[PDB]
Homo-oligomer: A and B are copies of this chain.
Amino acid sequence: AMKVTQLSSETLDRAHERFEETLAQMTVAEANTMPAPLIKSVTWLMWHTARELDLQISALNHSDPLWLSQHWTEKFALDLPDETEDWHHTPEEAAKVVVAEKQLLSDYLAASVALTKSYLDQIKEEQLSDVIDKNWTPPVTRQVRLVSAIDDAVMHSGQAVYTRRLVIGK
């Protein structure tokens, strides 16, 4: 009766809620603040979480990511190029992920969470064993990628709490 993805979906909701509770305590200047070379800003963490859900789920869904298809890239207007492949940001590139208003982060994350939950609700259980990248040992399956996407979001929501503490002392 219950979907095999329902608990993962409820777990993603906790990540979503945590990012929003953290952001609510900050000004946009604070949210944009990266406290150290290896400690990302809350703005970077929320953008990255929304971006990674978007890109990964859109790739499993063979659809263009919302970043492009809903034109979030124009709202963000990042001083970073949109490129074929995603890459690991240098500290100096990460400092360029800043926003004019907090609402944008909330809106793009809400859109990416919605997309993720829609995919989770529609994936058939037989599809979870599908190999999506054979060039790893062991191969990457749909299931591995889905678990990675939920893990990433939740773990980043924890990091956002720490950055908040470092930036605003509470």
| Interface, chain A (partner B; CB < 8 A) | 1-8, 10-11, 14-15, 18, 36, 38-39, 125, 128, 143, 146-148, 150-151, 154-159, 161-163, 165-166, 169-170
Contact = CB atoms under 8 A, between A and B. Distances in A.
Contact of A158 (B3, B8, B36, B158): B158
Contacts of A39: 162, 165-166
A155 B151 CA distance: 9
Contacts of A38: 165, 169-170
A10 B147 CA distance: 7
B8 A11 contact: yes
24 contacts: A2-B4, A2-B125, A7-B8, A11-B11, A11-B147, A11-B154, A14-B147, A14-B148, A14-B155, A15-B151, A15-B155, A36-B165, A38-B165, A39-B162, A154-B158, A155-B157, A155-B158, A155-B161, A156-B158, A157-B158, A158-B158, A158-B159, A159-B161, A162-B163
Contacts of A128: 2
Each complex incorporates copies of this chain amounting to 2
Contacts of A14: 147-148, 151, 155
Contacts of A148: 14
Which of A154, A169, A170 neighbours the largest number of chain B CB atoms within 10 Å of its CB?
Answer: A154
B125 A10 contact: no
Contact of A4 (B6, B36, B146, B155): B6
A153 B169 CA distance: 24
